[PDB]
Enzyme design. Structure first.
Site, PDB file in Angstrom:
ATOM      1  N   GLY A  11     -69.689  53.999  19.114  1.00  0.00           N
ATOM      2  CA  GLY A  11     -70.066  53.498  19.579  1.00  0.00           C
ATOM      3  C   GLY A  11     -70.714  54.242  20.741  1.00  0.00           C
ATOM      4  N   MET A  12     -70.914  54.625  21.957  1.00  0.00           N
ATOM      5  CA  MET A  12     -72.156  55.427  23.194  1.00  0.00           C
ATOM      6  C   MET A  12     -70.400  56.308  23.803  1.00  0.00           C
ATOM      7  SD  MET A  12     -73.802  53.744  25.981  1.00  0.00           S
ATOM      8  CE  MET A  12     -74.558  52.768  24.490  1.00  0.00           C
ATOM      9  N   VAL A  13     -71.174  57.696  23.781  1.00  0.00           N
ATOM     10  CA  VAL A  13     -70.112  58.396  24.147  1.00  0.00           C
ATOM     11  C   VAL A  13     -70.674  58.913  25.804  1.00  0.00           C
ATOM     12  CG1 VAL A  13     -68.686  60.532  23.905  1.00  0.00           C
ATOM     13  CG2 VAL A  13     -69.080  59.559  22.244  1.00  0.00           C
ATOM     14  N   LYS A  28     -64.983  58.223  25.670  1.00  0.00           N
ATOM     15  CA  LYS A  28     -66.118  56.803  24.337  1.00  0.00           C
ATOM     16  C   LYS A  28     -65.413  55.544  24.492  1.00  0.00           C
ATOM     17  CE  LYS A  28     -63.523  58.314  20.511  1.00  0.00           C
ATOM     18  NZ  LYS A  28     -63.093  58.332  18.723  1.00  0.00           N
ATOM     19  N   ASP A 123     -60.592  63.176   6.542  1.00  0.00           N
ATOM     20  CA  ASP A 123     -61.659  63.361   6.801  1.00  0.00           C
ATOM     21  C   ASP A 123     -62.380  64.299   7.825  1.00  0.00           C
ATOM     22  OD1 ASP A 123     -65.238  62.636   6.239  1.00  0.00           O
ATOM     23  OD2 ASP A 123     -64.620  61.249   8.196  1.00  0.00           O
TER      24      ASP A 123
END
Ligand SMILES: *CCC(=O)NCc1nn(C)c2ccccc12
Length: 321
Positions: A11-13, A28, A123
């Site tokens: 999502g948006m940061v 975040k 990851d």
């Protein structure tokens, strides 16, 4: 809607000024509750990051959410401000050998701590290595992390996998679930190679192409290394391929420090059992300017949706007024 109380302004940061500690921060927005997979990964990250405390691992400074489960539709995670990441930095900047050495040191120092907690990151890649203007490095994104489970690592040939393709160890495509520490060392080796040339070493375009790329450089696995793969479909796949010779690292990376290439070779070993471990890597001559095991700390101990949202609510309670 990016709604972070009055504490954080300007999502948006997003970046934002913190009015209690007079420093800017990163924030975040996580709107995970509409998807089960978003929820599991959110809880796993929060629990890990709140338990971890290490200079080379991103911390959680604050979590913002509504005072009740009913009103909670988003969670905001507040972290130290970090200007950039290694993915962005490699797209435009040549790294000196000194910068490569220092970044690799900090990746391995952070990884020593993670592995000492019996956690696998799973990851690691350049975009999950945050950097500031003084080149402090912090590992982020523990959404795919797992507790290590080597006794349950085995699986069949061509088993689907979630983590980023270009940094996947050869065994993922052959017989491994990515439940051992050696999975993370392969990714670090890929990152080291990428720092040396600013290009990913094994940019596979799809699942089995990734193994093609790896074998194109390492060459055909030895008989001994094949004998370790009991899985018949994986073994016979490998036996079906034409013989490929190893590409020498010094030909692939003619400007690299020879000691860097010796360590690279040891991280990018085909057979995960023979692959170097994080503490051996720290002790390698390439890192001798920095190696200091007394200053490479370890962790003090090993580490449905409706219950998952409750678990996230409970886990984030300590940041409430
Ligand atoms: C691990 C990947 C991630 O969270 N990246 C987003 C991100 N970008 N910057 C500059 C960050 C600083 C602190 C925390 C997260 C940040």
């Amino acid at each position: 809607v990016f709604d972070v109380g009055p504490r954080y302004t300007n999502g948006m940061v997003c970046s934002a000024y913190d009015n209690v500690n007079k420093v800017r921060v990163a924030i975040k927005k996580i709107s995970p509750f509409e998807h089960q997979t978003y929820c599991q990964r959110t809880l796993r990250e929060i629990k890990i990051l709140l338990r971890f405390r290490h200079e080379n691992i991103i911390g959680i400074n604050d979590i913002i959410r509504a005072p009740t489960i009913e009103q909670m539709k988003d969670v905001y995670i507040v972290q130290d401000l970090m200007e950039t990441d290694l993915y962005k930095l490699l797209k435009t900047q040549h790294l000196s050998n000194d910068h490569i050495c220092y970044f690799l040191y900090q990746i391995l120092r952070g990884l020593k701590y993670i592995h000492s907690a019996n956690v696998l990151h799973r990851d690691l890649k350049p975009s999950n290595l945050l950097l500031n203007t003084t080149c402090d490095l912090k590992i982020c994104d523990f959404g795919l992390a797992r507790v290590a489970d080597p006794d349950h690592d085995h699986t069949g040939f061509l088993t689907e996998y979630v983590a980023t393709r270009w940094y996947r160890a050869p065994e993922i495509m052959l017989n491994s679930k990515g439940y051992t520490k050696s999975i993370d060392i392969w990714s670090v080796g890929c990152i080291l190679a990428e720092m040396l040339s600013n290009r990913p070493i094994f940019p596979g375009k799809h699942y089995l192409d990734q193994l093609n790329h790896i074998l194109g450089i390492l060459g055909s696995p030895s008989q001994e290394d094949l004998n370790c793969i009991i899985n018949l479909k994986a073994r016979n796949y490998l036996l079906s391929l034409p013989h490929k010779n190893k590409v020498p690292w010094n030909r692939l990376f003619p400007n690299a420090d020879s000691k860097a290439l010796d360590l690279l070779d040891k991280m990018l070993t085909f057979n995960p059992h023979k692959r170097i471990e994080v503490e051996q890597a720290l002790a390698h001559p390439y890192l001798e300017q920095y190696y200091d095991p007394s200053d490479e700390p370890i962790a003090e101990a090993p580490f449905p949706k409706e219950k998952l949202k409750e678990l996230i609510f409970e886990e984030t309670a300590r940041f409430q007024p």
